[PDB]
Amino acid sequence: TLLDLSATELEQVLYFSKYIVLDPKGAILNGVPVEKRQLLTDEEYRELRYGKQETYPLPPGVDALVKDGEEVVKGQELAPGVVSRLDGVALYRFPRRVRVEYVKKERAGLRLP
Amino acid sequence: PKISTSDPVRQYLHEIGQVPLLTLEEEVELARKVEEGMEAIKKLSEITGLDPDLIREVVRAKILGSARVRHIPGLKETLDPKTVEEIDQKLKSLPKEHKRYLHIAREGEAARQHLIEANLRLVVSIAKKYTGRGLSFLDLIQEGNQGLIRAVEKFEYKRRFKFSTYATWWIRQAINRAIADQARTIRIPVHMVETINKLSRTARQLQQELGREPTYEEIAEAMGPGWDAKRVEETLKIAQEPVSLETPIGDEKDSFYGDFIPDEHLPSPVDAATQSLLSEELEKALSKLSEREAMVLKLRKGLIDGREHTLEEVGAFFGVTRERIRQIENKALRKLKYHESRTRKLRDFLD
Amino acid sequence: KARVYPFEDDVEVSTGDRVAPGDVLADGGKVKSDVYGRVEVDLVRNVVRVVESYDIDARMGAEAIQQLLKELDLEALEKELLEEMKHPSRARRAKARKRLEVVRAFLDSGNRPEWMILEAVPVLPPDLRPMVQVDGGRFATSDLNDLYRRLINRNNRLKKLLAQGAPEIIIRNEKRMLQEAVDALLDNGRRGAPVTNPGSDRPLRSLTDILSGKQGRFRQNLLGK
Secondary structure: OOOOOHHHHHHHHHOOOOEEEEEEEOOOOOOOOOOOOOEEEEHHHHHOOOOOOOOOOOOOOOOHHHHHHOOOOOOOOOOOOOOOOOOOOOOOOOOOOOOOOOOOOOOOOOOOO | OOOOOOOOHHHHHHOOOOOOOOOHHHHHHHHHHHHHHHHHHHHHHHHHHHHOHHHHHHHHHHHOOOOOOOOOHHOOOOOOOOOHHHHHHHHHHOOHHHHHHHHHHHHHHHHHHHHHHOOOOHHHOOOEEEOOOOOOOOHHHHHHHHHHHHHOOOOOOOOOOOHHHHHHHHHHHHHHHHHHHOOOOOOOHHHHHHHHHHHHHHHHHHHOOOOOOOOHHHHHHHHHOOOHHHHHHHHHHOOOOOOOOEEEEOOOOOOEEEHHHOOOOOOHHHHHHHHHHOHHHHOOOOOOOOOOOOOHHHHHHHOOOOOOOOOOOOOOOOOOOOOEEEEHHOOOOOOOEEEEEHHOHHHHHHO | OEEEOOOOOOOOOOOEEEEEOEEEEEOOOOEOOOEEEOOOOOOOOOEEEEEEOOOOOOOHHHHHHHHHHOOHHHHHHHHHHHHHHHOOOOOOOOOOOOOHHHHHHHHHOOOOOOOOOOOOOOOOOOOOEEEOOOOOOOOOEEHHHHHHHHHHHHHHHHHHHHOOOOHHHHHHHHHHHHHHHHHHHHHHOOOOOOOOOOOOOOOOOOOOHHHHHOOOOOHHHHHOO
């Protein structure tokens, strides 16, 4: 009654399924600055106060982008063929192959006719 | 608005499926951050001079403490106000080579949070087999969960044990000692549970090996060397539920078990009145007595302490002791005999 | 999705911190951060990642609720409803006028709408819930007495878990289990009652069952003293 919160509304806040807001300043995938009230779920919350993150797997093959293992634009291809549906930062994980290139310098002996 | 209510079980188990299993490499890598973070924490407390227990809070009060900084700081046992920053402000204001440890401490505590989450299904997978044994399925998962936390603290990644089958042990331990502690309306020692949990095992064999129900003599000679016949009876009286005052009695509708249980602690209208007419006659019996023919018996008996070997030692403020106090209750106790045998006031107050 | 920021020498704010806009992020106030988020501070490669994320006070539990009820102003909600009063008439008045009467009666007593939410749970004196010994070294007690134990282990186990600073998921499950618990004590049956584990499936006579004589007790009442 006193909180213009419904019957069912009151549940998801008192039995732990949907977060009621109090102080926000934010708008993601809504484009709407969500006001000082009303409920939202986990996979909604784990997006707002956590951010958008996505991990991706691979067989024992090759990277085909960890050289550019810094930045990515939506749908960009990497590896044999993986493509990530997110626009942000691509990042290394568990390296199995690392090439060490040994730059060396000497002094030669010559004798030309 | 009724689609589902008993979600607590299902609800959790679906929140629980949200977090995915770890690699034989991810498990490892996550653990390595925490041990270092734990060291880093010391390394900081070594340099700051602050306490390991404290730093660990002020570090958690950031990685978690977006709001986690408790609403009321333990009613001011804990401090969570302006104080938190000042500490993390000193930790930020370290020179770079000591400061680096903070960024290890943050990474570790963060890695801690993860290592728990990823293995929370393992708790469920174990606590399910432990269900019904006195305690709730959730109540078991919650206990086992902090068994899974305990596993995380007391653990070294260098010894490459398979963590799957490692925490498994800690987990059970937490559930077992939980069951033995909570699952009874009367708390009972942990070995006392195992005595009955040996009985419970032992009773089933003798139920089939003898055909009939075995006796108190039958059980000791099968339980262990130092077991008595009279004993079992006590370990069985002890074992029971017990009865609920809110049990209904035959009629089923109105009468409950408790309804028929009398009082005997409180004095009854007859008693109370007696245990006040006996008194109002004592101040009408030794009222015409000396304040030492009465007060000695009002220190021996009129003030409650035996005074068997407590009055002869202490000179009792102003008087005489030794071979005379063991005759002062002949000056006092044997004075009360005549005024009782002549005007027979006190004769009937016996029964 | 994270705005990366590289540093040359100095760096303030650690991983877990929350930033923006134009806030000093590195190098004696040279490298600042634009967007809101969680700081990462990459130990290996010198680049302080700021993960695209807000910081929202968006809570579950009666904690969140308890707040609102403090933050509520009656005086306001009375006159603000007095405007809602008789303007859509057959629609958003008929309900918005019922709502009002509560505010009035709340304002007529002197009760803060937060006292409805419990944080200090009182406990019935022990004698009227006794633990008496009967026959054969066996006892008898109330359901109330077993409804409290199950509550406490959960509040007590919460203090451990919160002290420990465990992951939120589990900090939750215990609060869910604590609402479920206080419920079943205050009024056990308004969500599918708990019973004395083995024994039978008899629901536990809760303070509610007790007062309104729910189980043939109000019929016993009028059978007099």
